[model samples]
Target: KLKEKENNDSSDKATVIPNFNTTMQGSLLGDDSRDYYSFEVKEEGEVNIELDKKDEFGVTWTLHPESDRITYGQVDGNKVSNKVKLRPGKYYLLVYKYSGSGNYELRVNK
Candidate 1:
């Protein structure tokens, strides 16, 4: 099982889904900053990810499934949300700044 309480920076270093929800609080700090997270579902299900809050640094995110390491979906906005369909497998979530720099909060739910 994946551990908890760390800002997982890559799919390989990503953490696990806890309580059907996960939250990240941090800042982009600068351009091109990226945050990565990983999670898995025991069975086919739906997942929701929301860029709950952010500073001037708008954020964009992409979802990559481990099966083929290909992006299946993306969300763009400083504060945005996306509901996606998922299979019983692992996934990598990538978050990055689209503009400027500032703090942010990302939430994921199953």
Candidate 2:
């Protein structure tokens, strides 16, 4: 499931929240099929982002579609981050594969 929330922190300003709960079903043969997902932001600014790379079975994750790279982060944990200056549009995220049987989370902070 996916959900969005809006609230204010100490600054008392409305903050946009975008989050996702995902599970990548594995194929039995371990094929190389890449999946792509996207995210949107209402505010035109920089947001703190994190990606969970591991699933239940010690599986690896790949961000950015072009290469066959793998992320070595812990299961259902986080990936290395780079800040982006986004302006109220859509951005793509890639999920390589899941190591085991479980779900993952996507967290964004403004």
Candidate with best lDDT: 1
lDDT of model 2, residue 42: 65
Give the local distance difference test score of model 1. Answer: 0.65
All candidates: CA RMSD (Å): 3.9, 11.6
Candidate 2 accuracy as TM-score: 0.41
Over the full model, what C-alpha lDDT does candidate 2 score relative to the true structure?
0.40
Residue-level lDDT of model 2, residues 32-69, one tens digit each, is 33334445666688654455543433333333212243
lDDT of 1 by residue, 69-108 (tens): 4543354554667788778877777776666777767667
Off by over 4 Å in 2: 1-29, 55-78, 97-103
Residue pairs in steric clash, candidate 1?
none
Report how far residue 61 has shifted in candidate 2, in Å. Answer: 7.8
Task: Report the number of the highest-TM-score candidate.
Answer: 1
Number of colliding residue pairs in each model: 0, 2
